[PDB]
Structure formats: structure tokens, C-alpha cells
Structure 1
Amino acid sequence: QCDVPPNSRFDCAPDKAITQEQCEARGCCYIPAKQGQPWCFFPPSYPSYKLENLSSSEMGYTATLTRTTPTFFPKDILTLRLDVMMETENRLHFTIKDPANRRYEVPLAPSPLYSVEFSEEPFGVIVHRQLDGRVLLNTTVAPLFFADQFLQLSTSLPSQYITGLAEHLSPLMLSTSWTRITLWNRDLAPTPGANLYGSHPFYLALEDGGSAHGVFLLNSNAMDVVLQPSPALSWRSTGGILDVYIFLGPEPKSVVQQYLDVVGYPFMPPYWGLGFHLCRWGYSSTAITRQVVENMTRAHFPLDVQWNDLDYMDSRRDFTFNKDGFRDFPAMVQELHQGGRRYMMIVDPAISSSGPAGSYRPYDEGLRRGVFITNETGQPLIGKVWPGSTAFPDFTNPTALAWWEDMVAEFHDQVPFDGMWIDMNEPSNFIRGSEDGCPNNELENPPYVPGVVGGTLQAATICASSHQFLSTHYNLHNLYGLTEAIASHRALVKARGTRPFVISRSTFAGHGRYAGHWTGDVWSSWEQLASSVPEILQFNLLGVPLVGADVCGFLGNTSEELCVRWTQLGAFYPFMRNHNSLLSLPQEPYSFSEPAQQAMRKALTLRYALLPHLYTLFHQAHVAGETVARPLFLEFPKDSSTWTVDHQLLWGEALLITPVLQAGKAEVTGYFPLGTWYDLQTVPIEREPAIHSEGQWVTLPAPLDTINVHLRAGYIIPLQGPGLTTTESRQQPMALAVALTKGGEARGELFWDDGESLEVLERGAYTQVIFLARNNTIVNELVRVTSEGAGLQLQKVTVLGVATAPQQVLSNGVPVSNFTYSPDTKVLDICVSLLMGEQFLVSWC
């Protein structure tokens, strides 16, 4: 019975330290590890549920599951209902529910790629990949627990390679060495082993050969996910139901798209949101804040969006501004707009509750309309945050949504801010639970407490048993940030009538449909620079492509060298903002030495040149569930050498970025998949020219002023001329960079709209163009042309991998006014006068 291989032992004492006698009294095996691995584990005969009355419907299957021997947790639900729904050829969905009681649920050849079978006793669901018979899910490997406050469902994993389960500071590929991953949204500076600000109960598992599948557990309760080296995984949740989606891929990119089909495709940001953002805690007046913009401009640094932190508020209260340093706040923001820039400011969820009645409308009106989370006696739960005593809005309450909309619109009428930076929305609390503590009940003190920092669900947040419109906070806590993001998205649409721009700290699965994210209070360290790459990649896999870390780091003091490298890498975060803590030394680009400034300016210039391409990538994310920043393994999954690479990133399919992530380095070694990769430094923007890789690591020169960026052969990138804002840059002529395959082929595209309006795709108010290189010609193919985009000027075409000097270069049949060819770099640079929205033909020979 107890002869179970060490790596396949599932823990029978996850709840407490246990003796041999107690372990054996549970019906479990006790075998100490020889050096983590559980000492108390389930024998193969441990009582589980039994499958009964399996029946077939048009959807799939239904059955009853019966447990006859209780577990060691209280309130086993002895009779359950199983429902299996074969929803698409790629998506399998099953639920396990209590048929006697509605439990909490998170609010909202022709053949499938999967096949499903069931084990009868012990009960399990087994999902095969039909094409190769690989076992993807097999829940028979351990008992099913389903008690009121403890659900556990386990499965074998098809390999040691698994990614997902945000938010944690870790490699992109998670460790299967007895790792406990905790999902409970928590205000904590990112550090390993800890539950951070968000929770995404989704994983993508790679399979030998390069196929992959994904699993989403649609459950918002505090949970542990435990990975072990057999390899296997156990979901351990503290409430709700088991609601499981399996996505069959087979390509990792298809897995992600299929997942996003369920939770939502990324929202389309406004174009200006892709520009540079600059912020700190400590810009303590409008004068100082205006000087930031002046100082950036004077030193030729692009800046699209100026931000303020808590500084602007009156006594740290939402929807106010102080009349000392920020007396002329409205005028400052109007001026920013006149110069072609936008403005963002921090908003906290918590609302000051201590002011004299009638003196602070957000609280007074909130009270009148019953918008706040309430406690046992039905009053607002009062915590402590920046303004002092605060109540917490309940963003599951439709009346609170209406109130938030009003507060945002009213404040916007005073100061016309262009989006919302929503912070502290875990929700963070400076004290435990509330000013008045929390009651003693099973929600506050549950039978299984996941591995949360502080050892309690109340730590750094509000009472678990507090009341929200849809349910208790116990069930809804992990949705708090998401629900505020939805409320703010709608608020901004109503107040401004154009695309919302919301950047949120706390997130849950599906967040990306409404908003972006930044990774929080990262230290200004080389370690955190390096860690930002896997984290940015992870959030893209989870459908939140508008993600980045605070450039140069938030906590502590940056060094000049670190800030150069971080600006270089950060210029490839899809969301790029330099933000800085209150007590830190300044780290704006203009605050550094001239050479450092030059390097920071080059990084920003390159990003701005790439903005039409980055915007097109966001379009693909929004319309097709693509990633914007993506790991090498998503693009080359059949090359197993890519699987553990997470200190390089791609933008889309074609742009490979290999950053220096350590002090004192003048070179960097990165993986180059099979193909030709052209050095982007050979493309004129206002050392081998090509790496010919067999699939191999290559050491690259990387002096302090350089970040390595390579363009994949077979791809065409649209670029646009420079500006200190997108308002300026969007008016510039465009260019193409055309990276030829050895056979002379390349493809790419451009998506263009007005940069801001809602319902663009539905209304068809966009231009969409494909570019094709073939047989010494470049043409455009007009997928759609409208007023927005038709008149975009193409003035430069740069062709990489042209082996021999051309004798003539033609544009629409006529010799061009000017071209140059470099025999050393194999680059043909062509001046033209063409329009993106009209069919052209460029050729050479």
C-alpha cells in the first residue's frame, strides 16, 4: 500500500504538523524523507469520491460523485455533481458542484483535439491529446477533496515545464521541486516565495516536442497551488467550486489565445499610452511638476504623459487637490494638453471617513448610497490608509459603480486627467482587518490557511467576513482590484468618451480586458532589473500585455549604470514608466551625466520610432489574443533550448531583444533560434550586421550605450519619424525596415486608426496594410483603407540582406531620387515618396 515513489507522494497532512500515529490514524502512510517531500502521504487506496450514474448529453457528460468516508477536514460535501462540456474543438470545460446548495461562483478531420475518460473509483478525469495520445490531465493521481472551505484537485503534468500562476517573483518556468504557490492578493514589495498583488489561476504546460495545453481554474478564493517533481500539481482552494477549463493549443500561442477567448482579449490602449510616462512620489507642487516636463523637453527626451502620486491631493484624499502646491492644478493639466501631452494621477480605493459630515462628498455621498463594504453590524468597515481612517468601496455593488462614475466625472470637470493609476487595490490596509478588529468565525479563521505572508487572510487587508453586494470578502478578495479596474474603465469611458487608460496594481484573471498593470514596489537593483523580464513575459501570457516595471526601480537609490541598462530594457516594456519612491534620489533621464543621457535618449528614440509596430502588436493582442512581449518559447516551441530562456524577449514574432542585466558587463550572451537575425543598428534611425544562427547561444558586444536588438529575416517593420510626444510623432513620415530571407522574402503589416476613439474595429474606422517583399520587389496590399491612415507618407525603405549592389532602384517604375547601398552591411537604403494607403511597387536589380 505505502510503496509510493518519493516524488509521487501527495501530502496527507497539508493542514498541520503530524505524528506517525496521527498520520496512520488518518489512513495515510508515514515514511520520513531521507533528507518539501511529505512524510505523511495518501496510499493509492485512500478514500476519494466514486463516480456514479455517468450519462451523456448533447453537451458532453453528467454524473454524481459520492464520498463515503469523510476526510480530516470539516464539512465534506459527500454528494457532488460533475458536468463535462465539450465546448469547442480546443476547449474542454468541467465543473464539480454541490447539487444541494448554490455555492459561490466567480461573477461574470472534424473532432476535438482532446478526448476524455473517467476513472470510477477513485474518481478522476483523464484528458488525452488525441493526436499523440499524451496524457495531459489525470486527476486520479490523488483524492478529490471537496469540503465547504477546502477543495483539492490534483493532476499529473506532462513535463517539468510549467508557467503561470501569477503574481510571484520567479523564473518564467516554475520550479516543480515541492513548490507552494499562493494566490491571495497582497500589498508586498516583490520578493520570492510570496503572494503578491494579483492572482491568476492559470497555467500553460509544455509537452515534449513543443505542443502545449493550458488549464484555468475559475476560482477566486485564497488558494495554494503545489507543484511536485513526479511531475504533478495540486489545486488547493479555500472555497467556491471546481470550475476547470482545458485549452488544447497545440501551439503555446494558441493556448494563450484560447484562454483569452474565455477571460477576454486585451483592451486596445490609446496610442499615447505607448509613449514614455514619468512619475515620482514627491513632485510636491505644480511648479516642480512643470519643471519635469521643461527639463525633459530641454534635453530632448520624449515624454507623452506626466504623472503625479499622492502629492496632488488635499490631505491624501481622492478627488481633491491641495490649495498650496497644487492651487493651479487645473491650469497645469490644461497646459499639458496644449503642449500635446496627457496627464495621469494616482487614485486609491479607500475613502476618508473621518472628516466632518457634509465636508467630503466622496464619503458623504458614498454613505448615502451604501457603496462601502460593511461589517457584522452593517456599518462601513473602517481601516487605516493614507488619509487616516477610511471606508472601502464595494465594486461589486452596482450603486457603487454609479457613485464611482460620478466621483470620477465630477473630478474630471475640475481637472481633465486622461486616465487613472489605481493603487493599493488588493485592498491594502495599514492595520489588520479593521480599526475594530474582525469577529471570530470560520471565514476569519478557516480550517486551511494558504501560505500567505503573515499567516492570516486579514494580514495587510480587511476582514474576510466583511460584506459585499455579491458575497463575502472571503470569496471576492482576489477580485477587488479587477472590480475597481472594471469600474474605472467604465467611469473613464463615460467621463471622456474615448479609450480608457487604467494602470492597476492588483489584478485577477481577465484583468487585461479592462486595464494594464505595473509590477509594483521593485527595488532599484540589478536583481530586480533581471526579474522584470520573466514577469513582463508572464503577464503577457496571462492576457495583460500592457505591463511594465518602474524603470530604474522604485525602492532605494538607482545607480547611473543601472538606470542606463534599465531604460534600455524598459524601452521594450509594453508599458514604459519611470517611477520613483519618496525618499529616493532623482532618476529622471535628465538628472544623469551627459553620456548616460545620450544612452537613455537613444533608447527612447528607438521606442518612439517603433511605435507604429508596437501599436500594431497591441491591435493583434486585442483582435486575436496574441501576446505583445513574448518569450522565445512561444515563437519557437519546437526548439527545446528556448524553453528556459526568460532574460531575452521578443516583440511579436520578429524583434529579439537581448539586454545586459548585470553591472560591469560590456557583452551579453543570448539564444538565437535557427534563422538569420539582422542587427537593428544597421537600420537608419533619426558587430556583425547579421547573425546566421543554427539555433545557438551567441555572445554579443554590449557596451554601456548599447542594447542588442535583432530583426528576424522574413519580416517587415513599420516605423515613424521622431517627436517628443506621439502627438508630434504621429504626424511624421513613415519608413519600412525589410528583413529579407535568403530567398528574398518578407512580410509584415501596419494597423492605423485615430489613436483614441472607441469602437474603431466595429465602426471600421481604421486602415490596415500588409507589406510583402519577393523577387526584388516590395509591395503593399490594402486590407482596409479609410480616412484615418489613407494619407500616411512613406518616405524611406531600408532593405536588409541585399547581397549585391543594385544598378537601379525603381519606385512605381521610375528611378528613385536617392538610394545608398553598403557592401559591408548588405543594407539598401531607399528614399521614396509613397502613401501607405495606395498600392505601390518598389524594385531593384
Structure 2
Amino acid sequence: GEAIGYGYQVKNAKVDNSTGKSLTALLQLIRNSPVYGPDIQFLSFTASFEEDDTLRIRITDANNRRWEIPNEVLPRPPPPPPTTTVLSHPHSDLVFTLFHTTPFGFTIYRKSTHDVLFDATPIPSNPTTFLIYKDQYLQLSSSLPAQQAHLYGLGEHTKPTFQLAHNQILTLWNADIASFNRDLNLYGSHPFYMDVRSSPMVGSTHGVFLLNSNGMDVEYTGDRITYKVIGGIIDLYIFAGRTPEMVLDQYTKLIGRPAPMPYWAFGFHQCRWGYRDVNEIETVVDKYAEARIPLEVMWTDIDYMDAFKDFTLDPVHFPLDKMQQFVTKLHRNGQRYVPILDPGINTNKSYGTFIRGMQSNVFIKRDGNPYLGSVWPGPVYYPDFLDPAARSFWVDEIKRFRDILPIDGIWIDMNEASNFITSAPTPGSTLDNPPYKINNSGGRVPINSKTIPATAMHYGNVTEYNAHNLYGFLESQATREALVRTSNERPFLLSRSTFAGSGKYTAHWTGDNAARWDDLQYSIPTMLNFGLFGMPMIGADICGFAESTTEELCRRWIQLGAFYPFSRDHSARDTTHQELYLWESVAASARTVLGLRYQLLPYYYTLMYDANLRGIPIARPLFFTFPDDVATYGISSQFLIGRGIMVSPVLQPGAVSVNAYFPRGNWFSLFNYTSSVSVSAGTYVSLSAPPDHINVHIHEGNIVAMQGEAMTTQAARSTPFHLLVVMSDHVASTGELFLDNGIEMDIGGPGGKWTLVRFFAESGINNLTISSEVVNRGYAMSQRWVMDKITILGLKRRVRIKGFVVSVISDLRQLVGQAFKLELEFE
């Protein structure tokens, strides 16, 4: 009945000289244990500053290379070449200390406040606190200040709170498990957390990322967090912050900046599993138009395929000629089309894709032969997306399909990879039967369950055991590559399975949620989480994927979902239909809220630009704007779009009001500028929320450029700009507008076919000035964009050109590309 492990001692350690300081230590195992398998006797330990704001701690086997995420998959700077050894840099707020105890320890603290960020000092009689390092069990633990540390992240899991609750285990093992299930490991793995400290120095935030693709359990008990990882190495990154936005900037610098999205992807999307034929999807499109509900993109689920085979069309229900006609008509109406692809290729002798796949040997193998799964068409082989040959095959299959049927984007699903059967384990393999069982599906379920077995092999003799969590991520890279090679437009793809870095390639949606009030709320923490994960294009299936929706739930869901960065109504086939036009109350709400969303299109687009530039999420937690307000840390039912717009949805059946938190200051309803909330300090306010209404407020100190409502994003972009200026007594109001053609591949690139406008507004005693600065005037000028109206909120006196009131300045006819300074006088 042994102890789990006995820990390590420092045998030597030095800080290098004359270079960007790094520390190298050699660690020797104290004593062996049989628990969880063979202990690595010698460890190479390094701490180094890859940037002034980013500390990297890398623990490897001193005597053997171990699995690491390939640099080609996630490119990053290479590794560097009692008694304590201390590492610190003059311009870094991070200080690293190696404790030569028995067993050894290490900490990282803030120079500026002495707050301990990460504390891996062992409690010597408590092996659960030790660094343990076995071939299939790595243990790394940090103490935390229970009440000061507020943690977020470690996806993908459905949770009723955004801030991680104390006393839980979060399992990371990509699995086809429905997101309507709380707690369970879902489709993606993001071993990142944000840690917002309420003191010392309120709002002081850092990030912690373990760059490891193996299955893991992360145990969080409030005063401790422990990683239990079944392979690979410890490659840990600490991001200094100190604001939450800085942390995401630092994190996305490492894992990849969010891919831009095309302008059209912010329009409304409609999909259903079960659409019967071309006539039905044409009918859906028509009825959206007839209801005057904006619809941008029509999607087809696996119904369109011939017997669920990728790259085919059902000759009876979705014939090529009628589908070609249908897509052409979409395109003539300013609309777009996105079909689904699964990764498994049906083992069918008449099937061209299968033939070319076999000819190029593109499939993942087990025991020397292609691994046989079961998915929608039955038997399948899975392309090895780690194999360059398979990626070329994928590009080719997509090019062939695109040649016959125009598409505007791709939805990649089932890519955990999902398998409908579980294969028998390889006798004697500790990969198929690992010594430590992670909490797969909340029941310590074997990792091979409903996926590709761990003993399957990939390109370069890589085991599925090691590469499993990378599959969806790899398919996303290959698919974005295929789209970029077959069209010069900025591509759009949506992926189910993801890993840290996936945001550089793809949007994500929350997966198989349910038509439940619980899931309506769950969409908010998941939306916020994916922003932290560097995947700002996130949304949930509006009205619920699984189970039949109700009129009321669907009405409250479109109200909320109209503000997701990715807004799509999708549903399972064994449920009632849930297109937005089916109920009048839903249709009316849809027009109102999609109306406002569409007016906000230039704003969403600008946020998408900021996200690609800095990693800052489009939909962000309140504490991103108000990190000094501790009350916002625990909020899980409100969120911001950009800096100053707050969405506060009703999330309860039968409710006609919502208790919503308002940070200090003046907030104005975007649906009625006369309606406002003014609070001298942050507090809950019981907002009226009639059946047809959702609360959406803008804070003082912000300026938002809007365009008009329209049925398509193209038509919306042809309308005048109206500037909404919300004055603050305390600060000048500012805002930003990024403009390009909506589809440029290199957003904000040196070609300069874009413009960036900054808006400013400041009150004097007797006057008010509103002005803009323009980058690349000639370009914006060439696009004829006109700002015709400015609405001024936040003041108690009316204003004119040479309780709160609203002032509107009309008929300006101002070119957006020409900087202006507008001077106003108080009445």
C-alpha cells in the first residue's frame, strides 16, 4: 500500500550568465514507487523568460525525449539551452524561486506586490502536493489563496458558473459527450486558467497554461490546484498580466491570435439536422424573408450527403443541379451556404473519396491496418490529419467538391474523433489500459470509449494516446488550408472539437446543448470561457439542439443568442422545428433583437479586429472592463459585447424582470435611449423585462458606430452610419471603427485596403467637442461611407451645433474617411 510518489531533490541548479536569464536545474528522484507506474529518475528543469511578461517552466526527462506538441502544430519559441536559486528580470513583474528542500519546490511571485501566483512548495507529509513524474502520471500542484484567487478556464466543460467553483475535478479528454451534461469533459481541451486576484491590488490577474495534449484531471479545491496528466511533459507558462486583457494578449501571443471572421459570418445562421430536401431548405429561406427576419447563411446538415458520405449529394433529395440552383439563388440574394463535413470516410468500394484516401494511405492505423470506426454512414476510416499526405488529400477532396458546388464555409463536426463503437484494448498495452484513470465522462471511463483507441498510430509513429486531443485542431488547420487554397476570400469554418490554439483557425459552438432553461444560461459561461481560450467566435445552438423547445424558451433564447459572436439556430431531427418564424412572439423578438445586432455589425466587426490584434474577446466578462469591481468576478449571467455594452438576459421561465448587476455609473438602454440606470456604486437592479424585451445597455464613456438594419449584411453595409456617443462626467468618451471589404485575407495588412477610425467626445463647461482620427483616409473615402447622424446621451442639457436628455445631430453627410471635429454648445 505504497505512497503515490516520494518527490525530487535538486542536484544542481544555476542561473545562466550574460544572457536573457534562464535557470537550469537537474532533479534526482528521491525513492521509487510502484503506484501509477515507473518514476523518471532524472529530470531536466528549466525556468526562463520568453518575454518580460511570460515565464516558462519546462520539466522533462533528463535522459529521454518525451512527447511534446509538435512545433509545426503549435509554433513557439524553443527551450533555453533553505538553499534557493532565484530567477528574476529587471523589467519583469515575475520572480521565480527554486527551493532546494526535500522534496524540492518552486514558486513564482509578483515583484510589485509580493503576491504568490504559483506555489509548488510541497507539504512534505502530503505526496498529493509533490511534483511526481512517471511515464503516464505527471503531478504538479500549486497552493492558492482560497478567497483571493478567482479562477476561470480549463475547458471544455458545461458549468452554471463562469468562475470555477471550489472542490471539483475538471477532466480534459476530447469526447463526443453532449454539452447538456454539466461537469463532464466535452469536445475540447484547453489547459489554461486565468487567476484574478481580489487582493493585494484588486484586479491583479495572471494566466497559467500547461502546454500538454495528453489526457488530464485538474483538481481544484480552492486553496490548491493539481494537474494529474497521463503523459507528455510539464511545459508551464505563466502570463504576468496584470489586467485580464493583458493576460489574453500574452496567452494568444503564444497559442495564436484569433483568426479573423468574414463580415457575413456575423449575420444570422439557420441549420437543422433533418431537412428533407432542397425544397425544404428553399422553403425555410423564403419563410425567413416572408417573416422579414434577417437570415444570412443557410446550412445543410448530413441530410444533404448521399448516405452520409462526405463530398457527395443525395441524388434524389439534394440533386447537384437543384443544389447548384439553390446556392446561386442564395448568392444573388446576398446570402451564403455552409455544409457539414465529418472526418470519417465510409469504407465503400464505389466511393471515390475512399479510393483516393486508400491510394494515398491517408488513414489512421492500428495494428498496421486502417482503424475501422463507426459513424453516420456506418464503417469508416479516419484521415490522419497529422499526416501531410492526409492534409493534401483533404484539400483535394474539398477542391473537387467546391468545383461542383459553391460553398462559403465549412462546418467540421464529430472530430474528437467520435466513434459509435469502443474497440477492445490491445492486450498488455498500458496505453489502452493506463495506470491512472482520468475521470472520463465523470465515471473513470476508459479513454478509448467512443473514440479511436490510444494504441492507434499517426504519422511519425505518434500514438493516439499522445495526439488524441489534437485531432479536431489538426482537421481545422487542414480545412482552413483547403478553403484558403480554393478561394481568395477570408474563410469561415466552425469546429466542434478544439485544442488551445484552435482559435487561430476556426469558430466553435457549444455543441449538443438542450432546449432547457439551464442550457440557456450555460451558454454564457461557455461563451466567456472560449474568449479566454482565444476562440472569440463562439455561440450556442439557439433554442436548443436536443429535446423540443417551447415558444417561451425559444423567444428568450433568440433574445440572448442574437448577441452571441456566432449566432445560429440549429436543432436535432427528432424534435419539433424551431425556425424563428414559427411563432409570432419569437419572430417579433427576432426582428427587434436581430435588428439591433445588425445595427451593431460595424461594432462586432471592429471587436473581431481587436480580437485578432490583441486576443481580446468580443463577448467578454464584466471584469474585463471593471477589474477593480470584485462583485463582477462571480457574475455568470451577464456579459459585455466589447468594452461598454452589457447584455442582461432573462434566464427563467415566466419571469418579466431580471436582477442584473450594474457597475458604477450611468447606463442607457440601446432599445430606448430614454431608459437608463444610474448607480453611485455597483449594485443589483431589478430590470423590467417584458416577454418581448431583453436588456442591453451602454455605459458612459463609450462611442459606438452603428449602421442601419437590413435583411443581409451586404445591404446593412450600404446604409448611413449613426454614431452613438455616451458622455461621461468623469472621462472623455472614446470608440473605434475598423473597416475593410469584409473578406480580406490579411486583415489590417500592409496592402492598406482598410481604415481605422477613432472617435472622441469631451465636455467643457459651455461646450462639447466630438471628433475623429482616421488611419488610411483614402481607402475609407473610396467606399463612400457616410456618418449622417450623431446621437448624444449621458448629459442633462440639450446640445446643438454652433433627468438625462437626448440630443441628435442630423443631416451631417460626413464622410467617414475624413476626420472631423464637431463643436457643440449647451442650450
Same fold (TM > 0.5): yes
> Counterparts in 2 of 1:260-659, with a 5 A limit?
260-327=252-319, 328-353=322-347, 355-356=348-349, 359-376=350-367, 378-433=368-423, 438-453=426-441, 455-470=445-460, 471-593=462-584, 595-659=585-649
Q: Using the alignment, how far apart are the partners of 2:264 and 2:806 within structure 1? A: 35
- Determine the structure 2 residue equivalent to 1:61: 23
CA shift, 1:804, in A, is 1.9
Q: Using the alignment, how far apart are the partners of 1:690 and 1:170 within structure 2? A: 30
Q: Using the alignment, how far apart are the partners of 1:134 and 1:698 within structure 2? A: 34
| Higher mean C-alpha deviation, range 119-128 or range 661-670 | 119-128
Name the aligned partner's letter for residue 814 of structure 2.
Answer: L
Which one of the candidate residues 136, 156, 159 is aligned to 1:167? 156
Say if 1:174 and 1:223 are closer, same or farther in 2 by CA, change over 3 A: farther
Say if 1:743 and 1:243 are closer, same or farther in 2 by CA, change over 3 A: closer
Which one of the candidate residues 118, 126, 141 is aligned to 1:154? 141
Aligned length: 780
Q: Using the alignment, how far apart are the partners of 1:749 and 1:497 within structure 2? A: 27
> Counterparts in 2 of 1:664-743, with a 5 A limit?
664-683=654-673, 688-742=675-729
Q: Using the alignment, how far apart are the partners of 2:780 and 2:399 within structure 1? A: 29
Name the aligned partner's letter for residue 340 of structure 1.
Answer: G
CA shift, 1:517, in A, is 0.4
CA shift, 1:682, in A, is 3.1
CA shift, 1:177, in A, is 3.7
CA shift, 1:608, in A, is 0.4
CA shift, 1:744, in A, is 7.7
Given that residues 153 and 529 in structure 2 are in contact (C-alpha distance below 8 angstroms), is that contact kept between their aligned partners in structure 1?
Answer: yes
CA shift, 1:761, in A, is 2.0
Please state if 1:133 is matched with 2:114. yes
| Higher mean C-alpha deviation, range 451-460 or range 290-299 | 451-460
Given that residues 767 and 789 in structure 1 are in contact (C-alpha distance below 8 angstroms), is that contact kept between their aligned partners in structure 2?
Answer: no
SS of residue matched to 2:600:
helix
Name the aligned partner's letter for residue 450 of structure 1.
Answer: I
Given that residues 345 and 419 in structure 1 are in contact (C-alpha distance below 8 angstroms), is that contact kept between their aligned partners in structure 2?
Answer: yes
- Determine the structure 2 residue equivalent to 1:48: 7
- Determine the structure 2 residue equivalent to 1:818: none
Name the aligned partner's letter for residue 774 of structure 1.
Answer: E
Q: Using the alignment, how far apart are the partners of 1:596 and 1:80 within structure 2? A: 61
- Determine the structure 2 residue equivalent to 1:662: 652
CA shift, 1:589, in A, is 1.1
- Determine the structure 2 residue equivalent to 1:92: 55
Given that residues 172 and 535 in structure 1 are in contact (C-alpha distance below 8 angstroms), is that contact kept between their aligned partners in structure 2?
Answer: no
Given that residues 58 and 236 in structure 2 are in contact (C-alpha distance below 8 angstroms), is that contact kept between their aligned partners in structure 1?
Answer: yes
Please state if 1:224 is matched with 2:217. yes
SS of residue matched to 2:735:
strand
Please state if 1:70 is matched with 2:32. yes
Given that residues 417 and 471 in structure 2 are in contact (C-alpha distance below 8 angstroms), is that contact kept between their aligned partners in structure 1?
Answer: yes
Given that residues 186 and 195 in structure 1 are in contact (C-alpha distance below 8 angstroms), is that contact kept between their aligned partners in structure 2?
Answer: yes
CA shift, 1:387, in A, is 0.6
SS of residue matched to 1:424:
coil
Q: Using the alignment, how far apart are the partners of 2:284 and 2:714 within structure 1? A: 19
Q: Deviations over 1:43-84 (max 9, x none)?
A: xxx721001210122241101010130122321101010111
Say if 1:70 and 1:77 are closer, same or farther in 2 by CA, change over 3 A: same
Q: Deviations over 1:393-417 (max 9, x none)?
A: 1100001110000000110001111
Q: Using the alignment, how far apart are the partners of 1:379 and 1:319 within structure 2? A: 24
- Determine the structure 2 residue equivalent to 1:259: 251
- Determine the structure 2 residue equivalent to 1:17: none
- Determine the structure 2 residue equivalent to 1:111: 91
Structure 1 residue ranges without an equivalent (≥5):
1-21, 28-41, 811-822
Name the aligned partner's letter for residue 700 of structure 2.
Answer: A
Q: Using the alignment, how far apart are the partners of 1:228 and 1:574 within structure 2? A: 32
Q: Using the alignment, how far apart are the partners of 1:508 and 1:260 within structure 2? A: 13
Q: Using the alignment, how far apart are the partners of 2:539 and 2:672 within structure 1? A: 28
Q: Using the alignment, how far apart are the partners of 2:165 and 2:535 within structure 1? A: 25
CA shift, 1:85, in A, is 1.1
CA shift, 1:581, in A, is 0.8
| Higher mean C-alpha deviation, range 739-748 or range 136-145 | 739-748
SS of residue matched to 1:781:
strand
Given that residues 657 and 690 in structure 2 are in contact (C-alpha distance below 8 angstroms), is that contact kept between their aligned partners in structure 1?
Answer: yes
TM-score, normalised by the number of residues in structure 2: 0.92
- Determine the structure 1 residue equivalent to 2:757: 769
Q: Using the alignment, how far apart are the partners of 2:561 and 2:323 within structure 1? A: 30
Name the aligned partner's letter for residue 798 of structure 2.
Answer: A
Given that residues 219 and 241 in structure 1 are in contact (C-alpha distance below 8 angstroms), is that contact kept between their aligned partners in structure 2?
Answer: yes
Q: Using the alignment, how far apart are the partners of 1:743 and 1:174 within structure 2? A: 30
Aligned identity (percent) is 40
CA shift, 1:730, in A, is 1.1
Given that residues 714 and 740 in structure 1 are in contact (C-alpha distance below 8 angstroms), is that contact kept between their aligned partners in structure 2?
Answer: yes
- Determine the structure 1 residue equivalent to 2:786: 793
Given that residues 181 and 225 in structure 1 are in contact (C-alpha distance below 8 angstroms), is that contact kept between their aligned partners in structure 2?
Answer: yes
Given that residues 162 and 526 in structure 2 are in contact (C-alpha distance below 8 angstroms), is that contact kept between their aligned partners in structure 1?
Answer: no
Name the aligned partner's letter for residue 711 of structure 2.
Answer: L
> Counterparts in 2 of 1:171-250, with a 5 A limit?
171-175=160-164, 177-190=166-179, 191-207=181-197, 208=199, 209-229=202-222, 231-250=223-242
- Determine the structure 1 residue equivalent to 2:822: 842
Name the aligned partner's letter for residue 325 of structure 1.
Answer: H
Structure 2 residue ranges without an equivalent (≥5):
72-88, 123-128
Q: Using the alignment, how far apart are the partners of 2:623 and 2:781 within structure 1? A: 34
TM-score, normalised by the number of residues in structure 1: 0.90
- Determine the structure 2 residue equivalent to 1:13: none
CA shift, 1:802, in A, is 3.1
Given that residues 754 and 788 in structure 1 are in contact (C-alpha distance below 8 angstroms), is that contact kept between their aligned partners in structure 2?
Answer: no
Q: Using the alignment, how far apart are the partners of 2:138 and 2:757 within structure 1? A: 50
Name the aligned partner's letter for residue 165 of structure 1.
Answer: L
Q: Using the alignment, how far apart are the partners of 2:583 and 2:427 within structure 1? A: 53
Q: Using the alignment, how far apart are the partners of 1:518 and 1:438 within structure 2? A: 34
Say if 1:233 and 1:176 are closer, same or farther in 2 by CA, change over 3 A: farther
Let me know the Cα RMSD of the aligned residues: 1.6
Q: Using the alignment, how far apart are the partners of 2:57 and 2:732 within structure 1? A: 45
Please state if 1:745 is matched with 2:737. no
SS of residue matched to 1:767:
strand
Name the aligned partner's letter for residue 815 of structure 2.
Answer: L
- Determine the structure 1 residue equivalent to 2:770: 778
Q: Using the alignment, how far apart are the partners of 2:387 and 2:676 within structure 1? A: 58
Q: Deviations over 1:113-147 (max 9, x none)?
A: 10111111221221011101111111123211111
CA shift, 1:827, in A, is 3.9
SS of residue matched to 1:161:
strand
Given that residues 766 and 786 in structure 1 are in contact (C-alpha distance below 8 angstroms), is that contact kept between their aligned partners in structure 2?
Answer: no
CA shift, 1:223, in A, is 0.3
Q: Using the alignment, how far apart are the partners of 2:701 and 2:804 within structure 1? A: 21
